[PDB]
Coordinates of C-alpha atoms (C1' of nucleotides) in Angstrom, one line a residue:
Chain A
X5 CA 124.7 -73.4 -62.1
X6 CA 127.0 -70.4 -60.6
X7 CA 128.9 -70.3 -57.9
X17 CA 127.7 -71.4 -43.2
X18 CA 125.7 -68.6 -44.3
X19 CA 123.0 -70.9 -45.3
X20 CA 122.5 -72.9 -42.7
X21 CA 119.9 -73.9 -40.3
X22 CA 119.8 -76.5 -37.4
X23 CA 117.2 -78.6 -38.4
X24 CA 118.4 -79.1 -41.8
X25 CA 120.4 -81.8 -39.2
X26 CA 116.5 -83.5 -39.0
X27 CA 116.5 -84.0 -42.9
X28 CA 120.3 -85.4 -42.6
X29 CA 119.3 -88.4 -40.4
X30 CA 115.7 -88.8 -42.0
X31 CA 116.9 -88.5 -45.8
X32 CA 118.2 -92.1 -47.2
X33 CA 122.1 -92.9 -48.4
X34 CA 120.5 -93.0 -51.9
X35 CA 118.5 -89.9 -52.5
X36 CA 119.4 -86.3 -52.5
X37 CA 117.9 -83.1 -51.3
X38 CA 117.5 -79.5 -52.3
X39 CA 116.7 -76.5 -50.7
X40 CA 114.6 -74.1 -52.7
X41 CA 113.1 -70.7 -52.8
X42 CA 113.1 -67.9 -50.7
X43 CA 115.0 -68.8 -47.8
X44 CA 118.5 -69.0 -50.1
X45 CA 117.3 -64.9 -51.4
X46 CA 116.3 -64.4 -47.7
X47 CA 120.2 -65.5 -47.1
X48 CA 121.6 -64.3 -50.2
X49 CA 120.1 -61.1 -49.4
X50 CA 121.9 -61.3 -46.0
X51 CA 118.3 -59.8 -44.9
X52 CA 117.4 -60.9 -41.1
X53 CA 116.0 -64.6 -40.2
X54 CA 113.2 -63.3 -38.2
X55 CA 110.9 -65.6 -35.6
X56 CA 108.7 -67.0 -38.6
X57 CA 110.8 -69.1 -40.7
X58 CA 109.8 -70.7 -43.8
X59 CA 112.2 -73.3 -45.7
X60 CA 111.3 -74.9 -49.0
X61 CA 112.6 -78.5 -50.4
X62 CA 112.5 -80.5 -53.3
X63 CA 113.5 -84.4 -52.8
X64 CA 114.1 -87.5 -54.3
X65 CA 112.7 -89.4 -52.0
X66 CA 109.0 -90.2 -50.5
X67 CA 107.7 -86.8 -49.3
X68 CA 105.4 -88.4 -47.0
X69 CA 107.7 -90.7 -45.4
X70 CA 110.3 -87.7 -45.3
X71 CA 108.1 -85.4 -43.7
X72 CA 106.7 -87.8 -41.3
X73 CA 109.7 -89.1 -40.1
X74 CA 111.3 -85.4 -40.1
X75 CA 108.0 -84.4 -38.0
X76 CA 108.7 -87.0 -35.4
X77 CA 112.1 -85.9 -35.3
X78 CA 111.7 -82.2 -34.7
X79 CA 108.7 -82.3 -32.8
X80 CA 106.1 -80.6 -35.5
X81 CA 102.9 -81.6 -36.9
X82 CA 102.9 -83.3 -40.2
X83 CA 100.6 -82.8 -42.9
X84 CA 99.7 -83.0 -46.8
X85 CA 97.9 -81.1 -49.2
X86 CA 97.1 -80.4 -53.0
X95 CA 101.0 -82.8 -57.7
X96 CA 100.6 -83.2 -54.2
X97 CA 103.0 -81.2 -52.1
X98 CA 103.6 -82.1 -47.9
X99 CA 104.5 -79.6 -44.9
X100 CA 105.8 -79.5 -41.7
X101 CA 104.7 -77.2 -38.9
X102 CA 107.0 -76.4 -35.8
X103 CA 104.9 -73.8 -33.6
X104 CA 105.6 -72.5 -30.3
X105 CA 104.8 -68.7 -28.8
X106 CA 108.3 -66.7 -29.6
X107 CA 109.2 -69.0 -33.2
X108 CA 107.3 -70.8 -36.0
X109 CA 108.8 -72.8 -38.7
X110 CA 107.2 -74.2 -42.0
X111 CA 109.2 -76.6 -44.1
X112 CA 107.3 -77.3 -47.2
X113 CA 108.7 -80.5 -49.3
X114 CA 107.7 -81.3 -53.0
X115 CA 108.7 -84.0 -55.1
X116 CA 111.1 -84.1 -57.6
X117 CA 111.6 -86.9 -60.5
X118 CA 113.1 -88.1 -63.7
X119 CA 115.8 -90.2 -65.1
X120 CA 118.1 -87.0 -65.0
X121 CA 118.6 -84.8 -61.4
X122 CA 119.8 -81.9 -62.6
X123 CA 117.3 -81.4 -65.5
X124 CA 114.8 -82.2 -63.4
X125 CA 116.3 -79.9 -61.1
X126 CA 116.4 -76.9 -63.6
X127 CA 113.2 -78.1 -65.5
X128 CA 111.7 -77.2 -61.4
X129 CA 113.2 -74.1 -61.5
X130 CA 112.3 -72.5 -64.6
X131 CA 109.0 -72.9 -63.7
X132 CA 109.0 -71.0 -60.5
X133 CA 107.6 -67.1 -60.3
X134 CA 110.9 -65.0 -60.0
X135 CA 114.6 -65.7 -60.9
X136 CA 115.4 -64.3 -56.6
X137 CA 113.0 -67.8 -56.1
X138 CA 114.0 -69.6 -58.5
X139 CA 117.6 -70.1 -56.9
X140 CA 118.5 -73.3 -55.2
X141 CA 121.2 -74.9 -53.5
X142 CA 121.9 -78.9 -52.8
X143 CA 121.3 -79.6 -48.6
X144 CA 124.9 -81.3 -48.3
X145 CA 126.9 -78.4 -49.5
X146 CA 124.7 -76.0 -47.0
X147 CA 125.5 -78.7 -44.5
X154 CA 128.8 -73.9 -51.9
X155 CA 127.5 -74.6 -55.4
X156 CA 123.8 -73.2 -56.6
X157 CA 121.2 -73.7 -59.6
X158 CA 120.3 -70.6 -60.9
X159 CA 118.7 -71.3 -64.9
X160 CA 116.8 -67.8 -64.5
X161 CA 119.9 -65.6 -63.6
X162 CA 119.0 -64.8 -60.3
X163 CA 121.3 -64.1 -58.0
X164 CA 122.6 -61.4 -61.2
X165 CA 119.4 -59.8 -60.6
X166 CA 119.6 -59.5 -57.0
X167 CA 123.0 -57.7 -57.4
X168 CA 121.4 -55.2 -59.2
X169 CA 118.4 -54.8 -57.2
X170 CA 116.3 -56.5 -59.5
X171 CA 112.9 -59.1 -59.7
X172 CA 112.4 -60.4 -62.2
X173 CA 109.5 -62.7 -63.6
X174 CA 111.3 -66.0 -65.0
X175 CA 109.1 -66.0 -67.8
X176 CA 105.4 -63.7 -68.2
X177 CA 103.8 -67.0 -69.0
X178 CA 104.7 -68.1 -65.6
X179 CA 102.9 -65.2 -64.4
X180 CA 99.6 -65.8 -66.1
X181 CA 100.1 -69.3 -65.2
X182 CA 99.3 -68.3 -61.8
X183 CA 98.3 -64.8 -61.3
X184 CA 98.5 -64.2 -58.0
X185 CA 102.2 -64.0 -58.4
X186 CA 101.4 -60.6 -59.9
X187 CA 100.2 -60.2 -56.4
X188 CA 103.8 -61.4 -54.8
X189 CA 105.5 -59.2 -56.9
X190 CA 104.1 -56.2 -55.6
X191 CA 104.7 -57.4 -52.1
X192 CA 108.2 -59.0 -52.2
X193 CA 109.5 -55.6 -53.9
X194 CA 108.5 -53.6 -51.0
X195 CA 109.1 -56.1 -48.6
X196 CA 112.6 -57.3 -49.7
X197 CA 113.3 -53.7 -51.0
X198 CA 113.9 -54.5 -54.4
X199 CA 112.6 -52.9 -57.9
X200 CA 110.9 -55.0 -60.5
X201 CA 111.9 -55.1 -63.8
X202 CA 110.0 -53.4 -66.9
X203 CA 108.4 -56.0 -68.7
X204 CA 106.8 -56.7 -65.2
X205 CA 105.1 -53.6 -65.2
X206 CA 104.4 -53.4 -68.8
X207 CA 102.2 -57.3 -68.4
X208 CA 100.3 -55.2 -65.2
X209 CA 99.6 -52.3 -67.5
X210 CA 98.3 -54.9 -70.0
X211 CA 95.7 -56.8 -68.0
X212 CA 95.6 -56.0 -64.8
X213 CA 92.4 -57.9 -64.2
X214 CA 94.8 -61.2 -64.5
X215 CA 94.9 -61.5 -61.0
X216 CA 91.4 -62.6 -60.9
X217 CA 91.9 -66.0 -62.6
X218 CA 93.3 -67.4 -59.4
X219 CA 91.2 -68.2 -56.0
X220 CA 90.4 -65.4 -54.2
X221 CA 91.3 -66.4 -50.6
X222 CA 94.9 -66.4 -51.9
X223 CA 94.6 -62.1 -53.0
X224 CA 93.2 -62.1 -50.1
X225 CA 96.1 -63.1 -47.9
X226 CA 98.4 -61.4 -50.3
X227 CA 96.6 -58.7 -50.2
X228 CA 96.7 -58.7 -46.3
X229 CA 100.5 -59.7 -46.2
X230 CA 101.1 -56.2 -47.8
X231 CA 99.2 -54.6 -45.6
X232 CA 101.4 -56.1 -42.6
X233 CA 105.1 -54.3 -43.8
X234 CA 105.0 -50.3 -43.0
X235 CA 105.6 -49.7 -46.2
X236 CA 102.2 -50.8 -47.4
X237 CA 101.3 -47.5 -48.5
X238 CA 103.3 -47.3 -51.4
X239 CA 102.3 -50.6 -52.6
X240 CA 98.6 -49.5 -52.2
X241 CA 99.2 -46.7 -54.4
X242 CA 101.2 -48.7 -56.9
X243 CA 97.8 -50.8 -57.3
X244 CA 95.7 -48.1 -57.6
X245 CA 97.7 -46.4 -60.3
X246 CA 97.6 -50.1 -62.3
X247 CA 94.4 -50.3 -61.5
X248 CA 95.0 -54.1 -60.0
X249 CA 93.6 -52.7 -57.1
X250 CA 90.4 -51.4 -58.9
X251 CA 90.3 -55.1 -60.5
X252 CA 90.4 -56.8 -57.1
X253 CA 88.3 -53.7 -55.0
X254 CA 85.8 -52.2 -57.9
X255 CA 84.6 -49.8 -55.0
X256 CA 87.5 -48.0 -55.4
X257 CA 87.2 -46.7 -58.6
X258 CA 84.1 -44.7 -57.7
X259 CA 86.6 -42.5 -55.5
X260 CA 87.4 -40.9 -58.5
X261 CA 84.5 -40.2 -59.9
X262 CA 84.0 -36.9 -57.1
X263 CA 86.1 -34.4 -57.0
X264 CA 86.9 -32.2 -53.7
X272 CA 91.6 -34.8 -55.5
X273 CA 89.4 -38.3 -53.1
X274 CA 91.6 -40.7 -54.3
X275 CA 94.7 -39.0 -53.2
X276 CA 93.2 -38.0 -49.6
X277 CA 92.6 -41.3 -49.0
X278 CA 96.2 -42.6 -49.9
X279 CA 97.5 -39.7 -48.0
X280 CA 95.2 -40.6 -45.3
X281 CA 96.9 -43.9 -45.5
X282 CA 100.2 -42.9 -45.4
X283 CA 99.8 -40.7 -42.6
X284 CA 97.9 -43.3 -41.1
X285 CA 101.3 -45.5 -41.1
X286 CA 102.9 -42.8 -39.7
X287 CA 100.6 -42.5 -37.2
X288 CA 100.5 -45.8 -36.3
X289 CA 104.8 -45.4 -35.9
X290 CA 103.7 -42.4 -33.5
X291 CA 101.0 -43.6 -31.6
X292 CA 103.4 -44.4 -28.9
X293 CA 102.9 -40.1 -27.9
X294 CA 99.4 -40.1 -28.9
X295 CA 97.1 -42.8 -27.1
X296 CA 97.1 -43.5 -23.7
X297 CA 98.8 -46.2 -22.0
X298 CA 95.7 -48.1 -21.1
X299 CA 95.2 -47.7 -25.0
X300 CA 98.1 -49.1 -26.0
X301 CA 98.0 -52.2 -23.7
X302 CA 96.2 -54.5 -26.0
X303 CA 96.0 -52.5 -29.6
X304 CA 98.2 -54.9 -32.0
X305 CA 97.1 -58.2 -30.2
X306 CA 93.9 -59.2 -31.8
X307 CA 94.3 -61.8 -34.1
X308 CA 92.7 -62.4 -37.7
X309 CA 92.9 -64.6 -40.0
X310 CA 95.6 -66.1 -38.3
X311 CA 98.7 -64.6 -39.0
X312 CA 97.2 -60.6 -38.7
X313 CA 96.8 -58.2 -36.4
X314 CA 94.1 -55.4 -35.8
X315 CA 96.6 -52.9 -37.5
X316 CA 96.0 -54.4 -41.0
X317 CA 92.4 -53.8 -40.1
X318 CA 93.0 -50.2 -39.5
X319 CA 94.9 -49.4 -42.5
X320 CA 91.9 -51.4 -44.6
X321 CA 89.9 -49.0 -42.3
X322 CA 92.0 -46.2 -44.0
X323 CA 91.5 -47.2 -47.3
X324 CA 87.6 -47.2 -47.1
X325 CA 87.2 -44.8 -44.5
X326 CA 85.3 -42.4 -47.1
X327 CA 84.3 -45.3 -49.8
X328 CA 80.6 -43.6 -49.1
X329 CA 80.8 -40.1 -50.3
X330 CA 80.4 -40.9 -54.4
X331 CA 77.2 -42.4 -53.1
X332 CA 75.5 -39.8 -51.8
X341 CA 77.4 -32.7 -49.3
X342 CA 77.3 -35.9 -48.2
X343 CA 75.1 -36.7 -45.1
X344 CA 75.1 -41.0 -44.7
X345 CA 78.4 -41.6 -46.3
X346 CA 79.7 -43.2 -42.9
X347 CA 76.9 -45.8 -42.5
X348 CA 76.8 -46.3 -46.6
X349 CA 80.6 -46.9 -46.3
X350 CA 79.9 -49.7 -43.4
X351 CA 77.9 -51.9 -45.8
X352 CA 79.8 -51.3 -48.8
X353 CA 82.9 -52.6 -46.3
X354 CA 80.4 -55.6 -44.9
X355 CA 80.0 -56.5 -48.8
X356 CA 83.3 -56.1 -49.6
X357 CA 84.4 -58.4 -46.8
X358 CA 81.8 -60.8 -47.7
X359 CA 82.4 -61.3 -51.4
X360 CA 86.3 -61.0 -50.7
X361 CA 86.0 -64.0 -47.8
X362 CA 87.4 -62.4 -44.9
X363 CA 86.6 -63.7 -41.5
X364 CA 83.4 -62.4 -40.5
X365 CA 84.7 -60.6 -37.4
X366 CA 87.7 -59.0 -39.4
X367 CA 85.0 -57.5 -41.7
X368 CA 82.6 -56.4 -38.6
X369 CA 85.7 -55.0 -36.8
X370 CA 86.6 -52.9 -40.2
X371 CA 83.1 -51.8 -41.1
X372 CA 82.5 -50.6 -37.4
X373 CA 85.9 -48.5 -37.6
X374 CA 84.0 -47.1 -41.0
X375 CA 81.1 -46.4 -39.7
X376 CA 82.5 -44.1 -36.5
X377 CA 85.2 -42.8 -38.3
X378 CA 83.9 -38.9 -38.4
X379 CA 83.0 -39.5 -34.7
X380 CA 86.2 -37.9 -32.8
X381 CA 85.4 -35.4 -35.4
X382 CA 82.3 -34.3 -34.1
X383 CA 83.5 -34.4 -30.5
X384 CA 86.1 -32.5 -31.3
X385 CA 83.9 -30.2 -32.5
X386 CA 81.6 -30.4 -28.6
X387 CA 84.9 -29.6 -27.3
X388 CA 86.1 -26.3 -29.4
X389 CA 82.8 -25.1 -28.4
X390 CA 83.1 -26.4 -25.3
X391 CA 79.6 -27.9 -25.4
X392 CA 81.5 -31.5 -24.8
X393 CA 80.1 -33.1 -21.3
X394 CA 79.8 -36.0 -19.4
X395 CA 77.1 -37.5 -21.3
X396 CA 78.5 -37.3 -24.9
X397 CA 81.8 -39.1 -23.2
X398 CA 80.0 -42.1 -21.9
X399 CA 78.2 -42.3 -25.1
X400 CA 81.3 -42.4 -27.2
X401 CA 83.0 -44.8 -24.9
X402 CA 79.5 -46.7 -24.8
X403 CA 78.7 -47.3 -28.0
X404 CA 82.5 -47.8 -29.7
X405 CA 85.1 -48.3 -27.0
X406 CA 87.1 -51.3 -28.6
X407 CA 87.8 -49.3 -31.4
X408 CA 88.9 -46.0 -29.7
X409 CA 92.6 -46.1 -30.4
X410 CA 92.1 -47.2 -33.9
X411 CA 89.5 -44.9 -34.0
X412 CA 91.7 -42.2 -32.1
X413 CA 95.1 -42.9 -34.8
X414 CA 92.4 -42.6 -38.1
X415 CA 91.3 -39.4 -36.7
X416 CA 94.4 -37.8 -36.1
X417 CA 95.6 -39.3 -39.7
X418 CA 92.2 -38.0 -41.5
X419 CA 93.0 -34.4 -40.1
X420 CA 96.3 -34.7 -41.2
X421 CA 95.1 -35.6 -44.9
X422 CA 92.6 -32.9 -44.8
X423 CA 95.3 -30.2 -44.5
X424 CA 93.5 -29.3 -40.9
X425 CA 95.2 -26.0 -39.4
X426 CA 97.6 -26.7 -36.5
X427 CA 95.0 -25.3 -34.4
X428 CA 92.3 -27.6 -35.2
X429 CA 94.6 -30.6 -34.7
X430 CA 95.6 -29.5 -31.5
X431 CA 91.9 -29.1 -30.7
X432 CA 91.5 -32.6 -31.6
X433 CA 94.1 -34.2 -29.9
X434 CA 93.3 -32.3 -26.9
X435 CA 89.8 -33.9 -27.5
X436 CA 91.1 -37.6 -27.6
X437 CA 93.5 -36.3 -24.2
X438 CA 89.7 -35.5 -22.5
X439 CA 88.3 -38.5 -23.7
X440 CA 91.3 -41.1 -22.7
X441 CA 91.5 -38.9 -19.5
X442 CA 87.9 -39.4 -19.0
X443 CA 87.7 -42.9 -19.1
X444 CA 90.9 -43.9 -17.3
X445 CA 89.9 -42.1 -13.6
X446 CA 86.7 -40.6 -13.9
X447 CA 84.9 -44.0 -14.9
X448 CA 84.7 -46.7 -12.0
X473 CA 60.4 -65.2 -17.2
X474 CA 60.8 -61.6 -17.4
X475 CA 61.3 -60.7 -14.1
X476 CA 64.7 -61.6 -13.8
X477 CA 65.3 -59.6 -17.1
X478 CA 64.1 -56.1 -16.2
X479 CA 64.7 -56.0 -12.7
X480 CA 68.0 -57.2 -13.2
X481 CA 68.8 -54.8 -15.6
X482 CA 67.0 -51.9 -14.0
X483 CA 68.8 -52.7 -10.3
X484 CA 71.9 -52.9 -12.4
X485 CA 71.1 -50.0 -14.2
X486 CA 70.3 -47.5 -11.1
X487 CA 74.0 -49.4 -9.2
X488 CA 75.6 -47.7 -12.0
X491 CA 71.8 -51.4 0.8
X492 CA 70.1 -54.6 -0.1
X493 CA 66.4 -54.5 0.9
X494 CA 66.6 -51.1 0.2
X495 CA 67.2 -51.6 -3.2
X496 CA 64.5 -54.3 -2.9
X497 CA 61.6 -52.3 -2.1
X498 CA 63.2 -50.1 -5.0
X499 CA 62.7 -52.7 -7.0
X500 CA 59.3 -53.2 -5.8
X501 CA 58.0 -50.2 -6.4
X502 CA 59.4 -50.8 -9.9
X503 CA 57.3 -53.3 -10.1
X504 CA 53.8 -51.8 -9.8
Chain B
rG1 C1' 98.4 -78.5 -38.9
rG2 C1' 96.5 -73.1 -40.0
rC3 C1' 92.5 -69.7 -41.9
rC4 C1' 87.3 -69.1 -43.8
rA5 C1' 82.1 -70.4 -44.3
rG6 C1' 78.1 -73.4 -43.0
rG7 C1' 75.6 -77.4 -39.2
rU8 C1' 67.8 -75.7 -37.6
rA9 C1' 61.8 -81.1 -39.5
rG10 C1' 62.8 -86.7 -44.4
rC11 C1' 65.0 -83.3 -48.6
rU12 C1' 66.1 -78.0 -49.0
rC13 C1' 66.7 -72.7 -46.4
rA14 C1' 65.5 -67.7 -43.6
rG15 C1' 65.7 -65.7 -38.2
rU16 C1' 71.3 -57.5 -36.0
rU17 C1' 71.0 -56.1 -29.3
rG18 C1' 68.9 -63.6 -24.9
rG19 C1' 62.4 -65.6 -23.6
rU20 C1' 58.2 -68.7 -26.4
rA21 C1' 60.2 -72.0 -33.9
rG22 C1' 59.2 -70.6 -39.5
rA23 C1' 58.3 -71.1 -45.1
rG24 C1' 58.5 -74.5 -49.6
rC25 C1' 59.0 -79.4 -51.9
rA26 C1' 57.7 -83.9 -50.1
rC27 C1' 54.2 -86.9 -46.9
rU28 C1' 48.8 -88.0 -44.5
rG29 C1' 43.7 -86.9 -44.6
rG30 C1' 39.9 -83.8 -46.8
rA31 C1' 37.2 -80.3 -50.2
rC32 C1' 35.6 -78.5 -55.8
rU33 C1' 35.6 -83.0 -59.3
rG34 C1' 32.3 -88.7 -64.3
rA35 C1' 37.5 -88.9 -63.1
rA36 C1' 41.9 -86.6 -62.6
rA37 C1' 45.1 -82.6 -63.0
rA38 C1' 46.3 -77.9 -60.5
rU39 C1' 44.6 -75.1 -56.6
rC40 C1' 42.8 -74.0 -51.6
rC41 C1' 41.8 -75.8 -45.7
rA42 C1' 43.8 -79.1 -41.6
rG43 C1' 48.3 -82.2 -39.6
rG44 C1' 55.8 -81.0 -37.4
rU45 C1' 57.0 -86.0 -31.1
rG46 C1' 62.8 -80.6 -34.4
rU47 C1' 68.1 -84.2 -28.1
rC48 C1' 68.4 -75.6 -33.6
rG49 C1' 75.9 -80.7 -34.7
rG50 C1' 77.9 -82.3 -29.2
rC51 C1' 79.6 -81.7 -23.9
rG52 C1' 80.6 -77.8 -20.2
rG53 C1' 80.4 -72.2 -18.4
rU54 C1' 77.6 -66.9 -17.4
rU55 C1' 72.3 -65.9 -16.9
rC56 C1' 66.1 -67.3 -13.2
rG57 C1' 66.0 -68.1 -18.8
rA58 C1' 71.0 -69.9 -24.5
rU59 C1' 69.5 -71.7 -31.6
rU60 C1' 71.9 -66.5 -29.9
rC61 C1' 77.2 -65.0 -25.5
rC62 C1' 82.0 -67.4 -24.0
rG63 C1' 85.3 -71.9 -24.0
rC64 C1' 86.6 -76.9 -25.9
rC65 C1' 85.5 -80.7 -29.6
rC66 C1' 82.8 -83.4 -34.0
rC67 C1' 81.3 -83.4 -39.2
rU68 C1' 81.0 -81.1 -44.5
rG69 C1' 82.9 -77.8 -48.0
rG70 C1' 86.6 -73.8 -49.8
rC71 C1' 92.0 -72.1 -49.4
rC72 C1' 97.0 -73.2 -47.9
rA73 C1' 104.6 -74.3 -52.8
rC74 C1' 107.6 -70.8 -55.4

RNA sequence: GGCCAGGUAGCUCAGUUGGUAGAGCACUGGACUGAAAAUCCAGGUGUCGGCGGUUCGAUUCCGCCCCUGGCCAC
């Protein structure tokens, strides 16, 4: 054990559901979050362990604050407060034995990182804290660290976290961390794959993401969980470092895109939902990281359509939603289209009909499509001129689509009247000399 | 409670832009057979999980539910 800032309203809620006779501890990130002084943001996830009856205590706690109750999995219970500007999680696990405080410690040995592994009792937040790992001595020096490796290959999607928490909390993880990656990096694949899944996604969220990506690739954890990117080495032009710089720009991009797309563009890019908790803008930096996962497959002529079912596969083994997949494998397949416009329009060959065909056949993905362009001829060390060209291409297209556009008979007349639209018994007798 | 994948004949499974339904085991009858095996030919009354919505037309598109399975601490 070593020795306001830690509080939060609802902890109240436990107060008056928690019994005179049992005691409560909160665990886990939210004391690094806080010890960190980093920002609470609008998701806010709290993690107990109790004494008491975690199903009455979460029940009860539930009808106090107003959230849904649940249980899952050893079997650990959650609360779930959701409304549109906040959500709250408050996970509560048991804890037992004829001692508390080895009990306490024999918890929190076992947890992934000594930053985690800190805890705090509930009455003193509402200050004296249980850190067996040396945690918070870590954090002052910048440091996570893995309580014990064997904790790690207990559960190796940790090995996952610890990528991700490093970025995301800014910190730098320790050597033997790094060393145990370098070892087996194909660890990671003893635990379910939904979980690197959404770990793998949940890096993908922060800005930073790029770095992380890169740090993967290099320990080949990345290789281990995406074998399809290995075979970007294999051809040389450097394709693995394009596409990371493609990435990185891409992030940068994605900061600018503000001065780049439209404002009709930008009204709903960010707000499509996947897999819950993710946005469309995880799907365009996955779009980034395969947008040439074609080219050691075949100059290369079908790399882009190769590269949309390699993409479909890889988001059907890796069980991603089935639209997230479709909606990354179709920003694959187009990629090199703005590309070949651009190229109508330095030529100046580009004309009304190859505009309402672009805007036809893609135009949900056009300001993903639009960012990946710009960050692909970025990557590709295109001259200043060319990338002016190009985003003067993207200005024609936006521009052209924002003013400029404004038992079988049913099915082809319909569809032929709607057809030539694009006045009524005129039309009709149109539409009867369509038929004969 | 959240995400993901499935739901089609008794069992078990296909079906990328909307039309009228498909296989195999199994089951019934029949044929070659002293007899049978096995093989060939014929037989599917399916509220395409459920109720709405757009369409003349929905297994397919959209919306809301039901059921089964997989994941959900740090």
């Amino acid at each position: 054990x070593x020795x306001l800032n830690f509080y939060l309203s609802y902890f109240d809620d436990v107060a008056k559901v928690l019994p005179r006779e049992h005691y409560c501890f909160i665990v886990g990130g939210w004391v690094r979050d806080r010890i960190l002084g980093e920002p609470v943001g609008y998701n806010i996830d709290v993690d107990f362990l109790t004494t008491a009856d975690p199903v009455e205590l979460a029940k009860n706690f539930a009808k106090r604050i107003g959230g849904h109750f649940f249980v899952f999995e050893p079997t650990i219970a959650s609360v779930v407060l959701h409304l549109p500007p906040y959500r709250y999680r408050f996970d509560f696990s048991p804890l037992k034995g004829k001692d508390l405080e080895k009990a306490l410690i024999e918890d929190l040995k076992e947890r992934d990182f000594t930053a985690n592994a800190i805890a705090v009792n509930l009455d003193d937040v509402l200050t004296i804290v249980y850190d067996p790992t040396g945690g918070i001595k870590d954090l002052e020096q910048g440091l996570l660290r893995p309580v014990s490796i064997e904790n790690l290959k207990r559960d190796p999607v940790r090995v996952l976290r610890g990528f991700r928490i490093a970025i995301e909390k800014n910190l730098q993880l320790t050597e033997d961390f790094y060393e145990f990656v370098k070892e087996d990096p194909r660890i990671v694949l003893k635990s379910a794959v939904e979980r690197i899944t959404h770990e793998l996604f949940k890096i993908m969220k922060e800005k930073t993401a790029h770095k992380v990506i890169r740090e993967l690739y290099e320990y080949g954890v990345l290789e281990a969980i995406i074998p399809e990117i290995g075979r970007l080495r294999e051809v040389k032009d450097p394709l693995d470092e394009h596409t990371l710089k493609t990435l990185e720009y891409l992030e940068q991009v994605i900061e600018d895109r503000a001065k780049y797309l439209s404002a009709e563009l930008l009204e709903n890019f960010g707000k499509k939902r996947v897999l819950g908790e993710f946005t469309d803008v995880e799907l365009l930096k996955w779009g980034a990281l395969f947008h040439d996962i074609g080219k050691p497959q075949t100059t290369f002529y079908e790399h882009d359509k190769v590269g949309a079912q390699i993409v479909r596969e890889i988001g059907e083994r890796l069980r991603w939603g089935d639209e997230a997949t479709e909606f990354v494998a179709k920003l694959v397949r187009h990629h090199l289209r703005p590309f070949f416009l651009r190229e109508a329009f330095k030529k100046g060959e580009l004309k009304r009909r190859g505009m309402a065909n672009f805007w036809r056949e893609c135009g949900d993905i056009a300001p993903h499509l639009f960012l990946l362009s710009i960050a692909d001829a970025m990557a590709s060390g295109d001259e200043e001129e060319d990338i002016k060209a190009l985003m003067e291409t993207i200005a024609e297209l936006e521009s052209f689509n924002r003013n400029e556009m404004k038992x079988x008979x049913x099915x082809x007349x319909x569809x032929x009247x709607x057809x030539x639209x694009x006045x009524x018994x005129x039309x009709x007798x149109x539409x009867x000399x369509x038929x004969x």
